[PDB]
Amino acid sequence: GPYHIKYAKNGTHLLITGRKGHVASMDWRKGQLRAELFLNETCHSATYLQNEQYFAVAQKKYTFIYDHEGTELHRLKQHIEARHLDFLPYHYLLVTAGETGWLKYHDVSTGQLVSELRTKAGPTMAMAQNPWNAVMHLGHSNGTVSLWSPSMPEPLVKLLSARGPVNSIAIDRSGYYMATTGADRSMKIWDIRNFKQLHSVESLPTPGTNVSISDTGLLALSRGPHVTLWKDALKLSGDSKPCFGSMGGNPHRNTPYMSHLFAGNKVENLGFVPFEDLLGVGHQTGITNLIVPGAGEANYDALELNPFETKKQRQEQEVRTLLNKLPADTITL
Amino acid sequence: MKIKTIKRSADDYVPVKSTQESQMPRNLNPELHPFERAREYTKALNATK
Amino acid sequence: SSLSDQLAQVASNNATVALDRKRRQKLHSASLIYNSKTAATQDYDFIFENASKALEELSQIEPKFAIFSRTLFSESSISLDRNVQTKEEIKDLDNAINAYLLLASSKWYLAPTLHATEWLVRRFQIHVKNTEMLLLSTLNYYQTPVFKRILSIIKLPPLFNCLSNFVRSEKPPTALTMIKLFNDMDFLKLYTSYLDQCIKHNATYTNQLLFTTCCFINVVAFNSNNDEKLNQLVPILLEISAKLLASKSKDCQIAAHTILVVFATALPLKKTIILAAMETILSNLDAKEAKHSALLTICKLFQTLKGQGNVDQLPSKIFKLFDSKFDTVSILTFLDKEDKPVCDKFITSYTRSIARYDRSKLNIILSLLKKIRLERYEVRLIITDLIYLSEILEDKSQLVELFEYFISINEDLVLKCLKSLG
Amino acid sequence: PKVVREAKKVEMTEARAYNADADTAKA
Amino acid sequence: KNSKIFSPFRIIGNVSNGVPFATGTLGSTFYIVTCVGKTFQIYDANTLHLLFVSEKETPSSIVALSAHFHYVYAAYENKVGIYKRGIEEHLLELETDANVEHLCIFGDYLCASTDDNSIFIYKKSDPQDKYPSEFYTKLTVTEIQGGEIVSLQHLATYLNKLTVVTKSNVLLFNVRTGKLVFTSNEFPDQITTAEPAPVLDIIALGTVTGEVIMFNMRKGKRIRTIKIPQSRISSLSFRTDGSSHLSVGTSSGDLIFYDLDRRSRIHVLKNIHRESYGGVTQATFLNGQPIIVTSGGDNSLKEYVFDPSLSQGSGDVVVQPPRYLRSRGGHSQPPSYIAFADSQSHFMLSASKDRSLWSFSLRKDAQSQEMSQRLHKKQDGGRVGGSTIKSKFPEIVALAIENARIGEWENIITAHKDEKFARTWDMRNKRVGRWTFDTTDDGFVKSVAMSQCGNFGFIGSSNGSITIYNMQSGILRKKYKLHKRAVTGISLDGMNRKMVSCGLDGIVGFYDFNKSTLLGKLKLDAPITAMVYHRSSDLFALALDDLSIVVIDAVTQRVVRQLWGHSNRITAFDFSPEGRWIVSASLDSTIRTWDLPTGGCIDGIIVDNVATNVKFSPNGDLLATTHVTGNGICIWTNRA
Amino acid sequence: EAAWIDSDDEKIKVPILVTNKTKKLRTSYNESKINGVHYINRLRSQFEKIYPRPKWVDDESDSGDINALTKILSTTYNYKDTLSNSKLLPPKKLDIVRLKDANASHPSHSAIQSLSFHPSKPLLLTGGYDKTLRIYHIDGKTNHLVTSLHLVGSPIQT
RNA sequence: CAUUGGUGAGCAGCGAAGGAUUUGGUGGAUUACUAGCUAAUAGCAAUCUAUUUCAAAGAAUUCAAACUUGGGGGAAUGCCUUGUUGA
């Protein structure tokens, strides 16, 4: 440990990467282990590519692409000291950021570096993709959030959302809200279409390590061993501001929706299971899924993502998604 | 208290008969189908090619 | 624990979820009537239609099957799924299934039972979830082809590990391997619980008792040399015998007689346990066939007793209970038959009981002694008590008729008792 | 094969306990 | 009685003296508090690792132990101490000479029952105070009210009621008002144990004749009766894991488990603890767990666990029998011999009258282990002769250890009582060796020694012959025959050149080991009893029967120092590592330190119990001694 | 119907909101002090939430019979009759212990051709082709030699 | 004649209610023993979260930031630097 967890887009597979280098890919529902690597190395994060067949692991200095059975396919010599990984499913681009302060977009299909951008703000502390428009949000040690596209050498937007390093960034499915946490014990909910700050929970009991937003819109926050959830937090109304306790049962104040305490563990990362009422939590001793009623999207669309997807539907879906890959330069605000 | 969670009937999604096709649920949510303009442009470009 | 071991537990829990098509093909293929290729093509409506007709045929044989038509074989059960059910509902479903397997236990020879149970196997996946109950109810049909089909589609629980060899095998499991299942102490507790449920429900039938008896009897023989393991069997199987004796069914009582008799020969027990056994044997003794087997059982147990008090008189309550169920005339007939089993010790205890408690049968003592030859010491004990009777009880024509009988046969031993006593 | 008897690892689980401090009361 | 060179440090090898241990919960974790003579020790239930030991030894032996969260209450004589992390926080002194017997703490009330049927109630000065200190009132149970108090218990959901359990019957006292709320009906049999059930209003009572009663206090009526004829209940405990189980401990050393729902016996654990030492003094189910912790007077603490049922259905019926999980222990009787295993002070070797040899660790108690007596297969191939029923080797009179060849072959020799051969052990394997050394002259083994190189083992017979074996191959190599009486000491210098022997005939023989020649012979006035050879200085001291210690220089074969002052036999003595002091113990209940350069006694001690062994650590930091009473080893710190 | 009543519990009045653990007892947010009778009933309910009430406590109580055999099994733990009282030895199990060898004290120089115990005294006689009649006092622990008699040129076949 | 080659048939000798070989699981050690959780000068351990919010403090022209590249030759279009044009 500690263990970083990343579920597949359709929620059928779980990818786990321990810090000391234990990487495993498994179908958690049927308990089948697709691959298990015991790399004697420091692994920071891993992500699935277009589907469960391939996944990427950010090791000590280089990122490696692996096969379904765990066979190494490529060593990405260009990506150096990557600490965060993200995959744009519609563009087939793999994104990395780390201690070099360099944002690199890599096309998995053709295997050519689409673009490498210099952030100029030192090491990158957080990363989150805007699923609506595929714009990457990076937090830095100066406390700003920068929006990036592969086709612009300079950031599209710069947002000052903290007085210290931004620990984590979360963006909702609709790409309308953003939630950022900083080392200054503050959580800020943003309106990224109009770039207006909505809420600012100025003082938290301890700095919030991670934030995640579900399909339904639940806001998840982790503070060391604690995991706290809020419902309807992402709204323009002032009453929707998160609070930890209602003062004398005031109806307007928005108390936590759910809470859970991992007694002796520091939470590593949070991931909502895509189409289930579950929240995955990676921690020092392993992984735990918390039952969160109302967390996930009840109604999925089979054309885009299908949890009951067969191999024949998979290899057909792989080609048509590859035929209509969106060009990288299409990415705009 | 009142607890309810997303609950999938496997028979509604995985047919019992081996000869039956699999059900394909459809949700026309825009949030589930991003890049409507970009995707159609590429399909237009592929059709032209 | 390695990650694979933890993932293995996850797979077992989600065995019947039917996540994808390959899982559906495996789960839906399992059948008791059809081969795998044909089974996967079928539909629940096709399966349910046939099962409904089968339940009607079973209903004609036995009205009790008509109840499940409202609950398990309803048209609304077609759209019922267990994975989507809450825990209270699943427990509640299992009780209904377990009750059905009890009723179906005795009709497996009939063809319709195989069709009706196909619905539960396909709809409710009893072969995966309720696997122990299904195996137990069909254990005595092990030579039948139906048991072979069950083994093919079932995953054996840990306690049924010996049957793993015969899963998908041409030869049916041998009768010798059933001793091995019952040899285990954990399995005996499980079978005891199942057999207890049948007795509570009066669902027991002769074929069940016979197979149950042979396995229990053979388990003693296999452990005869190991006295320590025999001791661990006593709490279990004698507790079973008590339950069988309590049952009003005579066939259950006769099985208890068989089980008790083998134990007494296999392992010597306290006379207190033997006397308690009579109290249970005689308390619920009403059937004539049970009455006949009980008397042979009672005679045999006293034969096993080999300690001081071997031939002492029965307790007051015990003797009164025995006489009511076996009047003096019946035992005289029991001794009269030339093929009587060895019962001298019981008659010696019975004879001393008469003198202590009922003087009027003192004439019967004379008839009893002529019919059966008692051993040298046993006659000495009877003489000793009758000598006390003369000192205490008034002299009687029958009482002197007993002494003169001992005068006629072995006069000298009569003097030795008198010399030692007065 | 005879029945397999493994001794599985056991790790303690937290349990709720009644606190006797609520019983005391002052007039 | 106070030494200027030595000060007590702690006791080694003792886990419990037989007083019922106390269990307390901190969060989800549990800990066990066990009594050890005048001190108590706290173990972690998960690992049975020692956590804390009482800072100071109580003036009198502890009688009761109760633990609630961080605080631990220990009762001794007429005083009740309150301890936190082993350090006393407050001492409650009762105002009557009657000694405390039983102790109960519920909420802000502390109840202490003296042997004169008087119950003292102490209350918290403030509601938020951590522990009770203020004296509230005194409640006395008269003979008319009930018999001798068996135990004090508090049932849940009872406001200010104390359930006093007496031999005759049970009583309900309201501590706040000090009035008798309720008196139970008299019981025909004497009550010996009480335990509150996890159910409401019901307390399990154990009688002297194998009867357990589920007495209901609210209804004041019997609910159930378990019968265990010809047995005495010593402990009771309920399973709170969701299974209605009841564990009944007995003075016979057996632990029975009942299924209350099914009215059946799950299993019986036979002879878990010795009947001679009180059997099962305490057996408690850990709250909400399937683990049960058992203790007894045999200096042992064990844990048993119930595994999940193997049947997928009817798990209630198919109950796995309890399995041994972990335990800690020590000698059941005082150690007879001790020795330091290594140059550093890590491990000590101990042997006791209970026919068991132990390796005790000073640095951590968990490392302490018992050396196996499993015998190796004979090299020749013949069947080894012995009783099929397995028995431990006889008591160990002597022991010799070296570490030159540890891990290569046997490196310990031991002598047994009334036995004509010496057994070898292996410290690395912690198991009895594969060689046995015989005297070859029909005499018992009286002395054992080993060369520094670790190759030779010397055996001294009661008939006066010294046989020399090779440790690697166990082949007899040499036999020296000078003494006509028993040889009570053998030693060889570090150089493996000059060998020295002593015997009851009073002569001291000097041999050249390599040349096998008699260098010289020295006669002393009285029979010699023991020998200690200091290899660095080539000096060895001899304990004579005239109550003297005679120091001799092997190089010159002359007496250099003679020590006088002991009033009785010298049980043991040892050299200091620097070779400058000798510490000796005698039957007159004294330990004296002697300064060899000046040849005079510089320090003196008076031990309550005669010290049977004395041993310096090779470092010199510690001095270890064993006493005629007590199962442990007293460790002293060398202030010099 | 409780056998006893305590009046102090009716008069006692306790605050709930002081300690955190007691806070869950409140039926409503407005109430802050309750008498002992209501306080106890709330504690009992909370106690049940921690320890659910089992079957054996409530529905069951102890307060020719068919169940005689079951009762005696519960009472008795050892089901095999003690062999000390019985005079007849068990069929297949022999309780036999070895003692010290008789000839250990004074060994014989040939095979033991015949043995004989003295009818009354505790003596054992040995003989062989060594032509010696050795008598031992068999006690089971020492077995010392009472006497010997060498018969020159007289082998002892019996 | 020799096998320090295999496979067997048997003695002498050893020899206490049997002996020999292999193996699954768990427990204790493998560093030297000061107890669990939290928002931690104290609470909790049955948690509170119906006081948990306010106030105070807190923003370097460092407005710098790949110390992180296998070698040789280039780099249309990109990217970096420098100037330049028009707003």
Side-chain angles (χ1 to χ4, degrees), chain E residues 296-311:
Chain E
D298 59 355
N299 193 15
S300 179
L301 190 148
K302 306 189 180 69
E303 302 194 358
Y304 296 88
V305 66
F306 287 74
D307 272 355
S309 172
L310 294 176
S311 66

mmCIF file of all heavy atoms in Angstrom, chain E residues 296-311:
data_model
loop_
_atom_site.group_PDB
_atom_site.id
_atom_site.type_symbol
_atom_site.label_atom_id
_atom_site.label_comp_id
_atom_site.label_asym_id
_atom_site.label_seq_id
_atom_site.Cartn_x
_atom_site.Cartn_y
_atom_site.Cartn_z
ATOM 1 N N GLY E 296 -5.206 -19.980 34.477
ATOM 2 C CA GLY E 296 -5.193 -20.896 35.595
ATOM 3 C C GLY E 296 -4.003 -20.612 36.484
ATOM 4 O O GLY E 296 -3.206 -19.711 36.220
ATOM 5 N N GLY E 297 -3.890 -21.395 37.551
ATOM 6 C CA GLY E 297 -2.807 -21.232 38.494
ATOM 7 C C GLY E 297 -1.487 -21.827 38.070
ATOM 8 O O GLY E 297 -0.501 -21.701 38.799
ATOM 9 N N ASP E 298 -1.433 -22.474 36.906
ATOM 10 C CA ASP E 298 -0.219 -23.117 36.423
ATOM 11 C C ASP E 298 0.678 -22.167 35.637
ATOM 12 O O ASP E 298 1.504 -22.630 34.843
ATOM 13 C CB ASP E 298 -0.574 -24.333 35.563
ATOM 14 C CG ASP E 298 -1.427 -23.973 34.362
ATOM 15 O OD1 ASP E 298 -1.823 -22.796 34.241
ATOM 16 O OD2 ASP E 298 -1.702 -24.869 33.537
ATOM 17 N N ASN E 299 0.532 -20.856 35.834
ATOM 18 C CA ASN E 299 1.396 -19.869 35.190
ATOM 19 C C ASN E 299 1.242 -19.923 33.671
ATOM 20 O O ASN E 299 2.218 -20.033 32.927
ATOM 21 C CB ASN E 299 2.854 -20.083 35.603
ATOM 22 C CG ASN E 299 3.747 -18.924 35.224
ATOM 23 O OD1 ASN E 299 3.271 -17.837 34.909
ATOM 24 N ND2 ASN E 299 5.052 -19.151 35.251
ATOM 25 N N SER E 300 -0.005 -19.846 33.211
ATOM 26 C CA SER E 300 -0.304 -19.972 31.792
ATOM 27 C C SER E 300 -1.535 -19.148 31.446
ATOM 28 O O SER E 300 -2.458 -19.026 32.254
ATOM 29 C CB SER E 300 -0.532 -21.437 31.405
ATOM 30 O OG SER E 300 -0.852 -21.552 30.030
ATOM 31 N N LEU E 301 -1.531 -18.585 30.239
ATOM 32 C CA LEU E 301 -2.662 -17.844 29.696
ATOM 33 C C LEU E 301 -2.862 -18.278 28.253
ATOM 34 O O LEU E 301 -1.944 -18.149 27.437
ATOM 35 C CB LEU E 301 -2.424 -16.333 29.776
ATOM 36 C CG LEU E 301 -3.611 -15.421 29.454
ATOM 37 C CD1 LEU E 301 -3.533 -14.148 30.276
ATOM 38 C CD2 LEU E 301 -3.674 -15.087 27.970
ATOM 39 N N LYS E 302 -4.053 -18.787 27.938
ATOM 40 C CA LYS E 302 -4.343 -19.347 26.626
ATOM 41 C C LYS E 302 -5.533 -18.637 25.997
ATOM 42 O O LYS E 302 -6.317 -17.975 26.681
ATOM 43 C CB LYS E 302 -4.643 -20.849 26.703
ATOM 44 C CG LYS E 302 -3.573 -21.670 27.395
ATOM 45 C CD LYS E 302 -3.845 -23.154 27.235
ATOM 46 C CE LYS E 302 -2.786 -23.996 27.924
ATOM 47 N NZ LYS E 302 -2.853 -23.879 29.406
ATOM 48 N N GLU E 303 -5.648 -18.779 24.678
ATOM 49 C CA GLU E 303 -6.767 -18.253 23.908
ATOM 50 C C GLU E 303 -7.261 -19.326 22.950
ATOM 51 O O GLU E 303 -6.454 -20.001 22.302
ATOM 52 C CB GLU E 303 -6.362 -17.005 23.122
ATOM 53 C CG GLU E 303 -5.823 -15.874 23.975
ATOM 54 C CD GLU E 303 -5.752 -14.562 23.223
ATOM 55 O OE1 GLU E 303 -6.090 -14.545 22.022
ATOM 56 O OE2 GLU E 303 -5.357 -13.548 23.834
ATOM 57 N N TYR E 304 -8.580 -19.477 22.862
ATOM 58 C CA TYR E 304 -9.216 -20.402 21.934
ATOM 59 C C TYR E 304 -10.209 -19.641 21.070
ATOM 60 O O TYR E 304 -10.773 -18.632 21.502
ATOM 61 C CB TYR E 304 -9.925 -21.536 22.678
ATOM 62 C CG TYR E 304 -8.989 -22.423 23.461
ATOM 63 C CD1 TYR E 304 -8.645 -22.119 24.769
ATOM 64 C CD2 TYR E 304 -8.448 -23.567 22.892
ATOM 65 C CE1 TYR E 304 -7.788 -22.928 25.487
ATOM 66 C CE2 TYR E 304 -7.592 -24.381 23.601
ATOM 67 C CZ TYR E 304 -7.264 -24.057 24.897
ATOM 68 O OH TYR E 304 -6.411 -24.867 25.609
ATOM 69 N N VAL E 305 -10.418 -20.126 19.847
ATOM 70 C CA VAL E 305 -11.256 -19.461 18.859
ATOM 71 C C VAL E 305 -12.220 -20.478 18.263
ATOM 72 O O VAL E 305 -11.876 -21.655 18.107
ATOM 73 C CB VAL E 305 -10.402 -18.800 17.755
ATOM 74 C CG1 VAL E 305 -9.676 -19.854 16.930
ATOM 75 C CG2 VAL E 305 -11.253 -17.898 16.868
ATOM 76 N N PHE E 306 -13.427 -20.020 17.935
ATOM 77 C CA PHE E 306 -14.429 -20.826 17.245
ATOM 78 C C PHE E 306 -14.395 -20.472 15.763
ATOM 79 O O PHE E 306 -14.687 -19.334 15.384
ATOM 80 C CB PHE E 306 -15.822 -20.584 17.823
ATOM 81 C CG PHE E 306 -16.039 -21.204 19.169
ATOM 82 C CD1 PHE E 306 -15.469 -20.653 20.301
ATOM 83 C CD2 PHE E 306 -16.825 -22.334 19.303
ATOM 84 C CE1 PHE E 306 -15.673 -21.221 21.540
ATOM 85 C CE2 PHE E 306 -17.032 -22.905 20.539
ATOM 86 C CZ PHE E 306 -16.456 -22.348 21.658
ATOM 87 N N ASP E 307 -14.044 -21.445 14.926
ATOM 88 C CA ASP E 307 -14.011 -21.217 13.494
ATOM 89 C C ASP E 307 -15.429 -21.215 12.924
ATOM 90 O O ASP E 307 -16.353 -21.759 13.533
ATOM 91 C CB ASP E 307 -13.176 -22.290 12.801
ATOM 92 C CG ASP E 307 -11.701 -21.935 12.721
ATOM 93 O OD1 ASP E 307 -11.318 -20.812 13.113
ATOM 94 O OD2 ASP E 307 -10.914 -22.790 12.264
ATOM 95 N N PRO E 308 -15.629 -20.607 11.752
ATOM 96 C CA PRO E 308 -16.955 -20.658 11.126
ATOM 97 C C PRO E 308 -17.337 -22.080 10.750
ATOM 98 O O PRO E 308 -16.482 -22.925 10.470
ATOM 99 C CB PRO E 308 -16.799 -19.772 9.884
ATOM 100 C CG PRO E 308 -15.617 -18.920 10.165
ATOM 101 C CD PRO E 308 -14.698 -19.779 10.966
ATOM 102 N N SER E 309 -18.641 -22.340 10.748
ATOM 103 C CA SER E 309 -19.137 -23.674 10.442
ATOM 104 C C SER E 309 -18.798 -24.061 9.007
ATOM 105 O O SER E 309 -18.781 -23.225 8.101
ATOM 106 C CB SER E 309 -20.648 -23.739 10.655
ATOM 107 O OG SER E 309 -21.169 -24.974 10.200
ATOM 108 N N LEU E 310 -18.528 -25.349 8.806
ATOM 109 C CA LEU E 310 -18.183 -25.880 7.495
ATOM 110 C C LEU E 310 -19.401 -26.177 6.631
ATOM 111 O O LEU E 310 -19.239 -26.464 5.441
ATOM 112 C CB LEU E 310 -17.355 -27.162 7.644
ATOM 113 C CG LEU E 310 -15.966 -27.025 8.266
ATOM 114 C CD1 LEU E 310 -15.325 -28.393 8.419
ATOM 115 C CD2 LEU E 310 -15.077 -26.111 7.434
ATOM 116 N N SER E 311 -20.606 -26.113 7.189
ATOM 117 C CA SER E 311 -21.826 -26.394 6.447
ATOM 118 C C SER E 311 -22.405 -25.090 5.918
ATOM 119 O O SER E 311 -22.580 -24.131 6.675
ATOM 120 C CB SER E 311 -22.849 -27.108 7.329
ATOM 121 O OG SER E 311 -23.294 -26.266 8.377
#
